[PDB]
Amino acid sequence: AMDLGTVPVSSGTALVAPFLLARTCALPISLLKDTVAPDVAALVRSAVTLRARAAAMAAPLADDLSRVVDTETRRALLKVRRDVFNGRHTPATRRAISLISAHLDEQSRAAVLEWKEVHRLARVAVEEAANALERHEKQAGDALMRALGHETVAPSLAMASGDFTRRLLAHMPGKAVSYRSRLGRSAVHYVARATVKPSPFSGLTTIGLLETGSISVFTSLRAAALELLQSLGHDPGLAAVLPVRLNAGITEVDGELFCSVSHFTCVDGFFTRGDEIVSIEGYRELVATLPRRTQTLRDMGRLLGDDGQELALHLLDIGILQPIAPWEPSERDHFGQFARWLAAVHNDTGRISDQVARLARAATEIGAGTMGAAERLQLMDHAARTTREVLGMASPTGQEPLWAKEVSPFHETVMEKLTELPSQEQAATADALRSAAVGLAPFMRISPLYSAMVDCFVATYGTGGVCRDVLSFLYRVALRVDASTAFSPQAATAARRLQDRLGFEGAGTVGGAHATLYFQVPDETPAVRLVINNVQSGTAGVLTRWTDNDLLGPRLTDSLRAWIDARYPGCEVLQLSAFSDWSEMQRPSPTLGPYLAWPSDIPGNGRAMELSQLKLRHDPATGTLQLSGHDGRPTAAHYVGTVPHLLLKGPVGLLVLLSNPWVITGRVDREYRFHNQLATTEKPEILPRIVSDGIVWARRRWRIRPTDVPRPETGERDVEYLLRLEGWRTQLGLPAEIYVAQVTPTAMGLRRKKPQWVHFEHPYSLWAAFTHLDPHCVEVDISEALPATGGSPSNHRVRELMGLVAFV
């Protein structure tokens, strides 16, 4: 794939949504910038400059030394030419210099004295550098710890790293923390996340709304509530009251019965669900015996006859029966709903309700008011333990899942009211986003898999045909359209052909091509206007989770609903998501409009539209598939999940593609491609900034091997290591402020880890980034910090912005 920003643009325009979301670091930059050591840096620079000036004086001097003379004077001359090569100056060197300096021409005597004066000067800069470094180590590590103690930040850390928070609360102010210690390396990482690197996973940012005091929004873990809900049927107490229903994901393809079987999983705290389309033809007679409306598990077992209870439980375990969850898809307090339901319907049956009630009380408490780091850490530890206990207890396997041992029981988002922008700055930012959108338009293509779905639909239902079981068709595409035919060159040709016909504005169910831009603007050749951090096709789903609160929720609800409706003119837009039965990060919004439930999802409490109430029709005029609801109402399914929809596999992702078939074909920020291959290039890869009209699509980057990075030798002086870092970074050409990303291999190619802030006048960030490289790291990807922070005022808080653009 090509690099974004590399195609010149001579046509096109774009609309910009009239609002921005801002993710602002919790602390001002000064809390990090005050821990720079500019005195250590200046001394190091001096020592490097002086040591290099003497190295350069060596060759002209060792020739001037010979440029004969008497013996002993000759013997001393050799010793001086000896030590001149080795950059030495021991007392036995200084005496030899005194032996000869009398017998030296004017030129060479001045050379020998200038060489010894520069050496001495370097020897003093180093020791003064080491003294300053020693003083900085007594002060800067403790300051970093104090910064993280601020009440703006410490309770967020208690959510994020429970174990580092213990270290923080157990730290006496003034007690030195070395840049060599693990605590010092961790401190500069958290302070950087709180001051210069806004990011969604740190918890050290706020979310606010801008046009063109602060609250906490909390969510409990949906997977823990769903896991417990699935277990309930295995207790005979609860099976008499647990409502269950026949899986709506059951339907026929070519007369054979199929089911989407859910594989609920957790990989490194990331909750997703794999969908496996599986034949259940043998269960047909059983499925036909069960009614389609909700009943208790116990009631279902009565309907089934001999061994009916055992059999109903088997159907529940494999998902042909599914429990009804006592919460709605948008719920943020799962165990509060779960405890309310348990109370309304009344051994292990009782202990389970008590654990649920304990979980429900932690949710009420954490949302009740401010808590210090210590209270927060105690509620979190307690909720996590209760969670582990009730899952193991209700499990028929006796054990709790592995992910329960290391996943937080709550998650927090901080919303903040922001000072609006001056109207001039609003206009200037909208113009830059418009320029960015014009430069992104050439990489917006219709996905070839969309054209393959149209062919499958026409092959199945005919031109202008109508499908009345949309689920059955989505299963058919997942069962019968493989990768080689979905991304064949015919597919791509058809997709390019469809785009020429359709245009960017889409048609009906097919919304207009749009994108979410994540970017930063300088505070402080054309000037930098805007720096791109990420780009996504469509409206980022995380925006819908921010509609559900008192601070910015109502204003964002109205702006977001207007923006999304404008993308599907003449359609009723339904909210659609992927596995929100498992992940609260995938939940729809309560305020934005009707929700379309995916049939294979475990169902919940509120009202949703059903996919079975919709039809799909081939529209020959436009070459699209059109979704329609009641009486043919034109319908769009707008994706609101946080997971990027192009990572979705299976029929869910195919339905999402029907309303957003638009994909971005350019590389974002020189990302590493998925193929497992061995690159060539050369040892130092220096990649220029990619920038057009002030839009910085790609930062300057430096790609090197781990062995190219100076690592401390055993018994090396600290100050000597800084001299190596300074000489290395200047030969490579690094600016004062950079980000360092370790690249490690995956099965799906090379992958950047999270970037580490480095300042070359900041000993803590240098040690934290360059001394303990991951053994699996095979490449170090360094980028310029941009916008740099050195030029910004001290009290300012760094933020990343989110904008929305629509192409025309």
mmCIF file of C-alpha atoms in Angstrom, residues 65-258:
data_model
loop_
_atom_site.group_PDB
_atom_site.id
_atom_site.type_symbol
_atom_site.label_atom_id
_atom_site.label_comp_id
_atom_site.label_asym_id
_atom_site.label_seq_id
_atom_site.Cartn_x
_atom_site.Cartn_y
_atom_site.Cartn_z
ATOM 1 C CA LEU A 65 55.922 15.827 16.598
ATOM 2 C CA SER A 66 58.273 14.325 14.006
ATOM 3 C CA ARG A 67 58.371 17.410 11.662
ATOM 4 C CA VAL A 68 65.837 14.699 14.108
ATOM 5 C CA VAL A 69 66.383 15.668 17.774
ATOM 6 C CA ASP A 70 68.653 14.298 20.508
ATOM 7 C CA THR A 71 68.120 10.996 22.316
ATOM 8 C CA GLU A 72 65.900 10.748 25.414
ATOM 9 C CA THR A 73 64.212 13.779 23.836
ATOM 10 C CA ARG A 74 63.569 11.330 20.984
ATOM 11 C CA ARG A 75 62.434 8.662 23.464
ATOM 12 C CA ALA A 76 59.939 11.041 25.080
ATOM 13 C CA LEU A 77 58.706 12.163 21.640
ATOM 14 C CA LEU A 78 57.609 8.581 20.935
ATOM 15 C CA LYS A 79 55.673 8.316 24.217
ATOM 16 C CA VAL A 80 53.855 11.552 23.345
ATOM 17 C CA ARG A 81 53.063 10.317 19.837
ATOM 18 C CA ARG A 82 51.963 7.074 21.535
ATOM 19 C CA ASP A 83 49.522 8.603 24.047
ATOM 20 C CA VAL A 84 48.347 11.132 21.426
ATOM 21 C CA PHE A 85 46.888 8.234 19.427
ATOM 22 C CA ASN A 86 45.124 6.813 22.513
ATOM 23 C CA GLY A 87 43.711 10.140 23.744
ATOM 24 C CA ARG A 88 45.576 9.659 27.042
ATOM 25 C CA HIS A 89 47.205 12.202 29.353
ATOM 26 C CA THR A 90 48.636 10.479 32.449
ATOM 27 C CA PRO A 91 51.318 12.168 34.587
ATOM 28 C CA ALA A 92 53.916 10.180 32.611
ATOM 29 C CA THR A 93 52.524 11.866 29.487
ATOM 30 C CA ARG A 94 52.722 15.363 30.971
ATOM 31 C CA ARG A 95 56.389 14.922 31.913
ATOM 32 C CA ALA A 96 57.316 13.764 28.403
ATOM 33 C CA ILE A 97 55.555 16.873 27.067
ATOM 34 C CA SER A 98 57.773 19.017 29.323
ATOM 35 C CA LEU A 99 60.855 17.149 28.048
ATOM 36 C CA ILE A 100 60.204 18.101 24.414
ATOM 37 C CA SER A 101 58.232 21.363 24.531
ATOM 38 C CA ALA A 102 61.510 23.290 24.727
ATOM 39 C CA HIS A 103 62.748 21.555 21.537
ATOM 40 C CA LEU A 104 59.540 22.148 19.540
ATOM 41 C CA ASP A 105 59.061 24.657 16.751
ATOM 42 C CA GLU A 106 56.551 27.424 17.404
ATOM 43 C CA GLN A 107 53.852 25.674 15.349
ATOM 44 C CA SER A 108 54.081 22.284 17.060
ATOM 45 C CA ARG A 109 54.586 23.602 20.608
ATOM 46 C CA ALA A 110 51.341 25.564 20.236
ATOM 47 C CA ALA A 111 49.805 22.367 18.824
ATOM 48 C CA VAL A 112 50.986 20.218 21.743
ATOM 49 C CA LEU A 113 49.805 22.771 24.295
ATOM 50 C CA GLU A 114 46.430 23.290 22.595
ATOM 51 C CA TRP A 115 45.959 19.512 22.489
ATOM 52 C CA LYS A 116 46.676 19.183 26.226
ATOM 53 C CA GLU A 117 44.499 22.202 27.105
ATOM 54 C CA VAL A 118 41.528 20.749 25.182
ATOM 55 C CA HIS A 119 42.012 17.364 26.872
ATOM 56 C CA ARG A 120 42.090 18.983 30.323
ATOM 57 C CA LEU A 121 39.023 21.056 29.412
ATOM 58 C CA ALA A 122 37.190 17.869 28.360
ATOM 59 C CA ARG A 123 38.259 16.071 31.544
ATOM 60 C CA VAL A 124 36.665 18.914 33.568
ATOM 61 C CA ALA A 125 33.381 19.047 31.565
ATOM 62 C CA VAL A 126 32.896 15.303 32.144
ATOM 63 C CA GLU A 127 33.368 15.472 35.932
ATOM 64 C CA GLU A 128 31.130 18.542 36.197
ATOM 65 C CA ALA A 129 28.584 16.742 33.999
ATOM 66 C CA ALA A 130 28.766 13.785 36.395
ATOM 67 C CA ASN A 131 28.265 16.079 39.397
ATOM 68 C CA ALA A 132 25.214 17.696 37.813
ATOM 69 C CA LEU A 133 23.891 14.248 36.827
ATOM 70 C CA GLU A 134 24.293 13.099 40.426
ATOM 71 C CA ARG A 135 22.347 16.131 41.686
ATOM 72 C CA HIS A 136 19.640 15.623 39.063
ATOM 73 C CA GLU A 137 19.227 11.975 40.122
ATOM 74 C CA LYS A 138 18.555 13.094 43.710
ATOM 75 C CA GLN A 139 15.822 15.530 42.604
ATOM 76 C CA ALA A 140 14.184 14.558 39.282
ATOM 77 C CA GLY A 141 13.072 11.006 40.118
ATOM 78 C CA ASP A 142 11.281 12.176 43.259
ATOM 79 C CA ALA A 143 9.699 15.053 41.323
ATOM 80 C CA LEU A 144 8.299 12.600 38.755
ATOM 81 C CA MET A 145 6.761 10.609 41.632
ATOM 82 C CA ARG A 146 5.307 13.758 43.179
ATOM 83 C CA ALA A 147 3.698 14.725 39.825
ATOM 84 C CA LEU A 148 1.827 11.412 39.689
ATOM 85 C CA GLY A 149 0.611 12.086 43.248
ATOM 86 C CA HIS A 150 -1.552 15.049 42.172
ATOM 87 C CA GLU A 151 -5.242 14.418 42.805
ATOM 88 C CA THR A 152 -5.962 15.093 39.119
ATOM 89 C CA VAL A 153 -4.067 11.916 38.277
ATOM 90 C CA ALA A 154 -3.401 9.492 41.144
ATOM 91 C CA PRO A 155 -6.921 7.929 41.230
ATOM 92 C CA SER A 156 -6.692 7.336 37.469
ATOM 93 C CA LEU A 157 -3.421 5.511 38.079
ATOM 94 C CA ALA A 158 -5.258 3.352 40.623
ATOM 95 C CA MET A 159 -7.577 2.207 37.816
ATOM 96 C CA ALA A 160 -4.659 1.676 35.391
ATOM 97 C CA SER A 161 -1.718 0.194 37.323
ATOM 98 C CA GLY A 162 -2.724 -1.103 40.720
ATOM 99 C CA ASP A 163 0.791 -2.236 41.493
ATOM 100 C CA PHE A 164 2.552 0.978 40.460
ATOM 101 C CA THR A 165 -0.018 2.893 42.533
ATOM 102 C CA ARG A 166 1.065 0.953 45.616
ATOM 103 C CA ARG A 167 4.637 2.080 44.907
ATOM 104 C CA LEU A 168 3.365 5.646 44.515
ATOM 105 C CA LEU A 169 1.432 5.741 47.802
ATOM 106 C CA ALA A 170 4.392 4.040 49.574
ATOM 107 C CA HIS A 171 6.893 6.712 48.430
ATOM 108 C CA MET A 172 8.351 9.248 50.801
ATOM 109 C CA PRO A 173 8.732 12.728 49.239
ATOM 110 C CA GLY A 174 12.406 13.635 48.877
ATOM 111 C CA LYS A 175 13.525 9.981 48.726
ATOM 112 C CA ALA A 176 15.685 9.654 45.620
ATOM 113 C CA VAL A 177 14.403 7.515 42.748
ATOM 114 C CA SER A 178 17.162 6.703 40.278
ATOM 115 C CA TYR A 179 16.765 6.897 36.508
ATOM 116 C CA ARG A 180 18.348 3.422 36.607
ATOM 117 C CA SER A 181 15.638 1.951 38.828
ATOM 118 C CA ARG A 182 12.488 0.231 37.646
ATOM 119 C CA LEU A 183 10.461 2.771 39.622
ATOM 120 C CA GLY A 184 12.140 5.677 37.829
ATOM 121 C CA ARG A 185 11.597 4.114 34.405
ATOM 122 C CA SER A 186 7.929 3.526 35.221
ATOM 123 C CA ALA A 187 7.530 7.057 36.630
ATOM 124 C CA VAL A 188 8.729 8.845 33.516
ATOM 125 C CA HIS A 189 6.405 6.628 31.443
ATOM 126 C CA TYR A 190 3.321 7.546 33.451
ATOM 127 C CA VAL A 191 4.237 11.253 33.712
ATOM 128 C CA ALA A 192 4.715 11.334 29.924
ATOM 129 C CA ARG A 193 1.320 9.748 29.404
ATOM 130 C CA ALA A 194 -0.122 12.413 31.667
ATOM 131 C CA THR A 195 1.688 15.386 30.078
ATOM 132 C CA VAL A 196 2.748 14.957 26.426
ATOM 133 C CA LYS A 197 1.303 11.729 24.873
ATOM 134 C CA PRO A 198 -2.519 11.721 24.894
ATOM 135 C CA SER A 199 -3.774 8.193 24.383
ATOM 136 C CA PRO A 200 -6.978 6.226 25.084
ATOM 137 C CA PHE A 201 -5.518 3.433 27.229
ATOM 138 C CA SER A 202 -3.459 5.463 29.745
ATOM 139 C CA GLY A 203 -6.430 6.932 31.667
ATOM 140 C CA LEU A 204 -4.429 10.150 32.155
ATOM 141 C CA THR A 205 -6.505 12.255 29.747
ATOM 142 C CA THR A 206 -9.937 13.887 29.646
ATOM 143 C CA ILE A 207 -12.507 14.088 26.845
ATOM 144 C CA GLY A 208 -14.104 17.404 25.933
ATOM 145 C CA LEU A 209 -16.203 18.979 23.203
ATOM 146 C CA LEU A 210 -15.224 21.964 21.017
ATOM 147 C CA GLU A 211 -17.150 23.837 18.303
ATOM 148 C CA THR A 212 -15.975 24.968 14.832
ATOM 149 C CA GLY A 213 -16.306 21.167 35.680
ATOM 150 C CA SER A 214 -15.265 17.587 35.063
ATOM 151 C CA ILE A 215 -17.103 14.321 35.691
ATOM 152 C CA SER A 216 -16.196 10.656 35.788
ATOM 153 C CA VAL A 217 -18.114 8.160 33.645
ATOM 154 C CA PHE A 218 -17.698 4.580 34.823
ATOM 155 C CA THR A 219 -18.449 1.243 33.238
ATOM 156 C CA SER A 220 -18.279 -2.233 34.699
ATOM 157 C CA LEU A 221 -17.095 -5.243 32.769
ATOM 158 C CA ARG A 222 -19.774 -6.720 30.498
ATOM 159 C CA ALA A 223 -17.897 -9.987 29.943
ATOM 160 C CA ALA A 224 -17.987 -10.733 33.675
ATOM 161 C CA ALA A 225 -21.753 -10.232 33.790
ATOM 162 C CA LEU A 226 -22.286 -12.259 30.587
ATOM 163 C CA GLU A 227 -20.043 -15.083 31.811
ATOM 164 C CA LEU A 228 -22.067 -15.272 35.039
ATOM 165 C CA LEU A 229 -25.352 -15.089 33.147
ATOM 166 C CA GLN A 230 -24.395 -18.098 30.982
ATOM 167 C CA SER A 231 -23.548 -20.119 34.126
ATOM 168 C CA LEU A 232 -26.848 -19.430 35.902
ATOM 169 C CA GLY A 233 -28.797 -22.169 34.096
ATOM 170 C CA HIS A 234 -26.473 -24.779 35.610
ATOM 171 C CA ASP A 235 -27.988 -24.035 39.041
ATOM 172 C CA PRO A 236 -31.432 -25.644 39.485
ATOM 173 C CA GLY A 237 -32.513 -22.766 41.709
ATOM 174 C CA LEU A 238 -32.042 -20.183 38.980
ATOM 175 C CA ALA A 239 -33.111 -22.394 36.052
ATOM 176 C CA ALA A 240 -36.721 -22.063 37.252
ATOM 177 C CA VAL A 241 -36.565 -18.269 36.825
ATOM 178 C CA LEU A 242 -33.902 -17.625 34.099
ATOM 179 C CA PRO A 243 -35.624 -16.411 30.893
ATOM 180 C CA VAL A 244 -34.223 -17.955 27.707
ATOM 181 C CA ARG A 245 -35.002 -17.793 24.020
ATOM 182 C CA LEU A 246 -34.286 -19.661 20.821
ATOM 183 C CA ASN A 247 -31.190 -18.180 19.132
ATOM 184 C CA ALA A 248 -32.357 -15.745 16.451
ATOM 185 C CA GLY A 249 -29.086 -16.485 14.634
ATOM 186 C CA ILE A 250 -30.615 -19.812 13.500
ATOM 187 C CA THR A 251 -31.661 -19.781 9.849
ATOM 188 C CA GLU A 252 -31.412 -21.727 6.607
ATOM 189 C CA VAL A 253 -29.057 -21.541 3.655
ATOM 190 C CA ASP A 254 -30.138 -23.692 0.695
ATOM 191 C CA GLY A 255 -32.489 -25.555 3.022
ATOM 192 C CA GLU A 256 -29.836 -26.587 5.562
ATOM 193 C CA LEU A 257 -30.136 -25.200 9.108
ATOM 194 C CA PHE A 258 -27.235 -23.068 10.364
#
